[PDB]
């Protein structure tokens, strides 16, 4: 039967015990999510609390990190999700993607609604990634992309 | 000689009357920045306070709004930058975004720093561009991509 | 073409003005809307600026309230959307809405996963009415109907 | 004689511990409220600390999940109401009935004052109800019912 | 047909005309709801943007005011209720029964539920009065009344 | 030597245990604060951290509650006043008071400035009691009286 | 007829016109309270929205600023106090107040409490005062005398 | 060699132990500072996690506490000064020094620029003492001296 | 007679039209605080609001810009300082300043203390300069000196 | 494999644990990054939650102040930075900083716009100093130099 959180801290405690036997362990989370069948993105949220592993999914990754069976247990709950402390990243790698909202945020909208019509871009039917990609002017390139479905708001 | 401002207002007032303008003339972003040479998202930023247009594409977009000349030289000024009047979007087509940060920050984090390194993904060194196509399941998606070039944290 | 807002003041104040002229020719919103072909709670939102109007509801509506034509055109903008002043309503009739979240908020969260699974009862797709019912025991009820589609969280 | 809290966290402590047992044993909230003669949403939210259980009650579901003596005795207590962690909610299912809000609080205020005046519809003498209804698009909707008393304001 | 506001702002505006005109008039509000069959505190809310004036009672302190005939017609709309500017009062008067609540506020909880049970005291089927006293001890006294009805919350 | 307190969680988690003791004793607020010759809202709010007890008083309410030495010095303490968790409270019970003060506090300044003068109408030369009483339309009222003596504000 | 404002910005924006006629004038608020019989720091607290001035000293204090009739009389008015524009001063000379109550709060709470009891010192019988003092060692000091009445906190 | 502290919870926790062993000992602050050379407010605000004392001092009060080697070494530590929780204090005695600032923050700014000139009267060179005294009209008042030094900003 | 602002927005709105007037002429920044004989950081932060000009001062950049009388009295008043809207920059040049804060203010915090003692530096003894030197791995960088007063804390 | 963090408690609970270690050794910053081959700004930070030291300095630094091997792989961990506990620091000497940015945060923004161009002076390509200078006219300056490399915001 599903199992929901409503305390985000009882999952994020558990992450800061993960990634400290993750380190203890010299894991990557590509090793971890791999043979998971599961995205490295998915799998890498779950951790980090913002997921839910199926049961499989959370034996395997266990297993791998030596947890116990109500950190296992744990992992499968669906949670109450929100991984920013207080509304603003203080983290300069968090930040800059909350800039790109304070930058181009009334751009997403204006050139959604041109695009799609009224509605959203959807942020629970939908995935993102992050590509690596060699700069032509040198150095690394991050391609992030953010991939989700229109939602359309119609009259009633 | 560069010019820049300093209270975001002025530039977000200009934006409601670039808006009217359009609306008027029942003009689209795309057809605004045709002829520019510069991207969709780019000149729309600008028209919404958030970027400076070169004097040449100002002028342009000038012609098509049919601005008075304080308005073009005012598109040409380096903006105060942050389009969210309130830290947090009450708009959902905006609050999506936000949305995907509380879900996925920590995950952006976590696989930034696994696959570059410490250090950030750049806002500035960065290029934002937004696809409409057709979701394969049935429907439309956005396909929004977040082009930033990686730089290190280093030691010193 | 599709035209959509960025500062929600100027939608706001179109509403305060739609307002005083409704007083002053003393109609209702169940009239207002009549002929519209759209249900009071959608023409509704629309003058009060969280929806926009089609161009047939729009001249209809502005005919009624003696809109002028950069008023009827602004109907037709999609906003800018979030009618509340600073987060937490400071209106009682309003605010009981809000502590029916804070109240009942994580059971809803509880019982969505349970009845439907991981992900959300959408507000895009989605209708709301109000139906006033005799009490059995005296007085008037409200019956408040939130009608959303379930849009599921699925591993990827 | 009726005893009551005034500090949250006990009761959201014990809402943890609860949640956990009941994942242990695998239980659905149907099942916990089964018995009890009182609605899935009331027990639900009791447990999750926003309302008392009677003593009966709280006997019945402190037996199903194992509780010790103080607990049973803490959900007979009146809680200390308020779910939301921070104001506005985090969790994209909790964040939706927020921009419900955001999008028609001034609408649900405006047409609860023309259906039936001055005043208020409570959130005390109250019922919510989580009903699943199959969409003939396809997929689930989920019907939220909020039936509030109304409580006039008149002149003194 | 009733009206209502959205936006305090314009309540709040009139607010300040009318207490321009009076101190310019010399007027008491004791003098202002002479005459309307109104309690001092209920016509003074009112002025004050906080409650909704019959048609007689506005046209009665409309002609001791000198208001125009939208002022006159805009203190019969039902307001967007809330007096304090940002939440917390900064004045000292007013300050002091916001202080009364950090003080008290448990207090007046837990005597509320031993003395009537689960529930609330009422913000809306209320009145407040203040009189004035002398102290035994020289100076004098307010005693400020609060008198709402008891309103339970049951089980469902 | 009197003593006193700066960090309000000390008294608040007492104020927990106390109110966990008084509930496995079936006790009532007005039952522990007889014998004192303190008023039940005074001896109430002392055990909800937000006044000092006298010595006395202090042995006779751990008594009856069973509180050890540490607990009834405690007590003693002149306290870090202030019960409201995060300024506006999330209680409907408590909220209640807060919003009377939203729709009410221009009008309690108004007023008390008429029939007192420019100052304050104190909150610690001031007392308060919770009266219930019959409701002539069936059910039941609180009284809460509010009684604070005027400080002028004089010029010099 | 006492008259009191609910608004501060009415009165701070008096202040403003105050201080640009003072300014023109090259007057100091030394020789504007001169001759009012009120001290400097009642009279400047007073032309900056703080306090209200008699007739004879708001006539006395107009005519040397050259202020309207409307300006004389909304001096008069008992303010709606607090001159701080969000909580924490960002002006560096008002912020070191701050930073004193930062710095030494508990402690001016814990000597009040031991020298005088439990209560407050006062805020409204009270007067403050700035006296420049040379400096032993070089340079000027100021001396910041507040002087406040002790109101006890008693048991009832 | 000096230490520093970045946590203000570290010494505030402290601060909680030191006034409870004051309170068992029923001691004064007064005779805790007695024999260090060490002014009241100075050590009083070192025990509250606000000042460093001296290694003579820390041992001396040490020992008069019956406080623990590591407890001694802390008090020497230089704090992460600020003792209010959150802001604005909630505790009344503590609340009204706030208030001076919301009330005479501005006449301070102006004073202090009217005779001293453009700059701060700093917070750091800087002493507080306060003195209980007859009220000549009946009571007791506080005189609060805060004696720092004027830094000029001078143009560069 | 010196003169001072108390609140931000006169000054920033003079700001606001400095800018605009400069954007016409084409001017620079060095160009303005020429023959001024003070430095270009000095007389930039003055045009912005957040320093006062000397007579002299204020009339050359006032020829330069074309300024009106009363605009140039403005600029030789004491500001009340703060240029940051709210509290945290949204724009990213600034808030690049306010991050390295973020992530070395408690390093500041501790290497002040170790290098000088308890105090602080000052922000009102002080100068700042911008300087624009090559990176020798290509590109520019900004070497921004802060020159503050070290102002020990000492016991008293 | 580089590891990364995602709560700030976790490294700064580690850094409360060091700054004791650290004075109970009597230990320098300055020494315990000596034969790190690191610069002391780097280091310190790194102790402190903000910055990753390399294992060699980890094991180093871990000698130095008797840390167990858990906390040498934690200071190995890429932080979660923000050392702000709550957006605005309380203490005077972090204060200080952040009070420079509010009377400099637009003039910094001002002339790198006008000496650099569009873009940002960089937080992550960037390092600090703080240096000792005696003033001249007696006493010690901190000179602290911020050198970031020039990011450019160009058209694309
Ligand atoms: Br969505
Ligand atoms: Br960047
Ligand atoms: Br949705
Ligand atoms: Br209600
Ligand atoms: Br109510
Ligand atoms: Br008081
Ligand atoms: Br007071
Ligand atoms: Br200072
Ligand atoms: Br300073
Ligand atoms: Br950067």
Redesign the interface.
């Known amino acids: 039967?599903?199992?929901?959180?409503?305390?985000?801290n009882?999952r994020?405690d558990l992450?800061?015990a993960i990634?400290?036997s993750?380190?203890?362990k010299?894991?990557?989370?590509?090793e971890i999510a791999d043979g998971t069948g599961?995205?490295?993105?998915?799998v890498?949220?779950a951790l980090?609390g913002?997921?839910?592993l199926?049961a499989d999914?959370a034996r395997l990754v266990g297993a791998k990190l030596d947890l116990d069976e109500?950190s296992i247990?744990?992992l499968?709950?669906?949670?109450?999700?929100?991984?920013?402390?207080?509304?603003?990243?203080?983290?300069?790698?968090?930040?800059?993607?909350?800039?790109?909202?304070?930058?181009?945020?009334?751009?997403?909208?204006?050139?959604?609604?041109?695009?799609?019509?009224?509605?959203?871009?959807?942020?629970?039917?939908?995935?993102?990634d992050?590509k690596?990609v060699a700069?032509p002017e040198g150095?690394?390139?991050?391609?992030?992309?953010?991939?989700?479905?229109?939602?359309?708001?119609k009259?009633?």
Chains 1, 2, 3, 4, 5, 6, 7, 8, 9, 10 share one sequence.
Not at 1 to 8: A, F, H, K, V, W
Not at 38 to 42: C, D, P, R, V, Y
Not at 139 to 153: N, Q, S, W
Request: glycine residues 6%; hydrophobic residues 45%; charged residues 25%.
């Open positions: 039967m599903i199992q929901s959180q409503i305390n985000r009882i994020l992450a800061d990634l400290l993750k380190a203890k010299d894991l990557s989370f590509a599961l995205a490295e993105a998915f890498t949220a980090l913002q997921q839910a199926p999914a109500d247990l744990l499968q709950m669906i949670p109450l999700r929100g991984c920013i402390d207080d509304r603003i990243p203080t983290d300069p790698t968090m930040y800059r993607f909350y800039e790109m909202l304070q930058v181009y945020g009334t751009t997403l909208k204006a050139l959604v609604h041109e695009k799609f019509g009224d509605g959203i871009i959807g942020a629970i039917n939908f995935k993102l992050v690596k700069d150095g690394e390139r991050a391609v992030i992309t953010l991939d989700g479905k229109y939602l359309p708001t009259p009633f």
